[PDB]
Design a protein around this ligand. Sequence first.
Ligand SMILES: C[As](C)(=O)[O-]
Ligand SMILES: C[As](C)(=O)[O-]
Ligand SMILES: [Zn+2]
Ligand SMILES: [Zn+2]
Ligand SMILES: [Zn+2]
Ligand SMILES: [Zn+2]
Lengths: 330, 329
Amino acid sequence: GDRINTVRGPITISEAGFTLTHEHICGSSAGFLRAWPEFFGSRKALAEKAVRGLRRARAAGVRTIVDVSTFDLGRDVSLLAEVSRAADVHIVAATGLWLDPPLSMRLRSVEELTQFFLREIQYGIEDTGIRAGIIKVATTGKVTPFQELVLRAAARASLATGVPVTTHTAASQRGGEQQAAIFESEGLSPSRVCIGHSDDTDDLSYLTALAARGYLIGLDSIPHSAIGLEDNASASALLGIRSWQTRALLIKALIDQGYMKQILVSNDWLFGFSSYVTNIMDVMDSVNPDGMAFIPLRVIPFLREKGIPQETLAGITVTNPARFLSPTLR
Amino acid sequence: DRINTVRGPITISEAGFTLTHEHICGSSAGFLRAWPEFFGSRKALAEKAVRGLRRARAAGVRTIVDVSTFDLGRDVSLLAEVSRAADVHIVAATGLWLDPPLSMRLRSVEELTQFFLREIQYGIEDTGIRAGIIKVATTGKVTPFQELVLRAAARASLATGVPVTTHTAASQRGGEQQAAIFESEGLSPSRVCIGHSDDTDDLSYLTALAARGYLIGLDSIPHSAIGLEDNASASALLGIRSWQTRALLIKALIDQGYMKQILVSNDWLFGFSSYVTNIMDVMDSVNPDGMAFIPLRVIPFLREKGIPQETLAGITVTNPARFLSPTLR
Ligand SMILES: C[As](C)(=O)[O-]
Ligand SMILES: C[As](C)(=O)[O-]
Ligand SMILES: [Zn+2]
Ligand SMILES: [Zn+2]
Ligand SMILES: [Zn+2]
Ligand SMILES: [Zn+2]
């Protein structure tokens, strides 16, 4: 129906407002924030940095973010709840698995993984009672056997609960096509799926064909760019060397092709990032001081100046996330 | 003179009969708290561990060293709970095993050193419980990241006096590469136990390590898949040699004059999610004695082979005390 799970409890979807559909409070690893908080200075410092950042995003018009950190990205839902409340910004938590499953996950069957995802959606995450409102999955270009289990478990959990699925792709590898085939083999509707990191490629043929099938297209890393940082290999590898404008122009491109309803936009920002090289967070913040406010402050005016009507931009940042997040079918 | 446990410091005289390589639960970081139903429930797992420790205690055991690291899903709050209920001392570990997540795998030796030091000097998580041992693991030749872990472990040991204990593939003589790295760092072999050393019959490999002053961890004695050789996963994990065959290594090293260098354990667990489903049931049917296997089966087996009480007490009480007591000499 029209209620979704947030880390402060259930809300009606009209309350979500401007929603960033792919963000992170902290990109980490299972257990890591609690075992080694000084990696982030302190847990308090991290929380305060996130509260400041979310408050700025709120001032810029953001009302909800979707934290697509899974278990193996070190999702700490107690932290998400703390910062959501202090910033007074809705946060939707995720279940699923990303690219770093530990052995206790890697060795599980599709049936076992289905029950883990269902636990996090239907019962709660850890002992917090906080329930996930979305399932996040990730694959390499060519889907591994384990990753295929994860996608099937995600599809089964979605069909059982109605909560949507969102993905990490290598867009230069057209990763969404293999994901989509697996999802549809499970009877999952494309309208319950966002193919993410789709702004990492300029292949409009790939993008429009997925959109034509009813998939949501995640243009979710707009401010990611290492232009000017070419001498930094780790930052280049992570952020790419296409401009944020180049990424943003894909939003216009899909609108022009008639697929405004299939677009979801985000920053894929974080306030801490331990699952990459040390100090990457400082590099990212030096490139994009706006953080999660980058979409409303820079991208929206960029799009309006290009001639895209207000109603279309509002449709993308409010209506599309609302349809996507509302639990649908069963 | 003082050893840190999950209930606080104890004097070496308090440690008594100590099992130096054990696990309450072999898991993954965050896993027990994210999916306790994998083990039935957290309560079920705790209760199994308390009964298990009480059985070990009734067989004479007074302390175990839980060598579960961060990435083996060590939950020291669980360790504290079961230690208290069973009245058995538990020494917690820092270090890294074979499943480091990205947030660990991407770290420098300097960063890893600070993490190991934090868990020894400050406490684990926000519990104030301090590690009393550093556990490391290698495969084969030693990977570049594993080398960083071993060096970080040596540096944390050298700063604190806390000993290092290892996981090897003994069939690949893996202790040799570990020893080389430790010695390059200035670490005394008397601070190092080369573990899973009972997984080979190469006595020349073992005695040579002992002769250099390493402790030899004969720590997986009941691990055997005899009869289960058509169970591939059990066979790869548990091996095809009998427990008597493993146990005879203890006698062999004593007869070579190295009783002071021997540490014995079960390497048991009460839950095990970082392997195939139902492995705990397979393991429990193979060794229904659990952590009581060493005192109930191995000690009488050695006594019947003519090893005197004084020697067995030196191995199970004196050697662990000397090893665990923090020392920079
Ligand atoms: C945590 As990411 C760089 O896959 O959005
Ligand atoms: C957790 As193990 C089988 O390396 O002792
Ligand atoms: Zn991603
Ligand atoms: Zn992301
Ligand atoms: Zn081991
Ligand atoms: Zn072990």
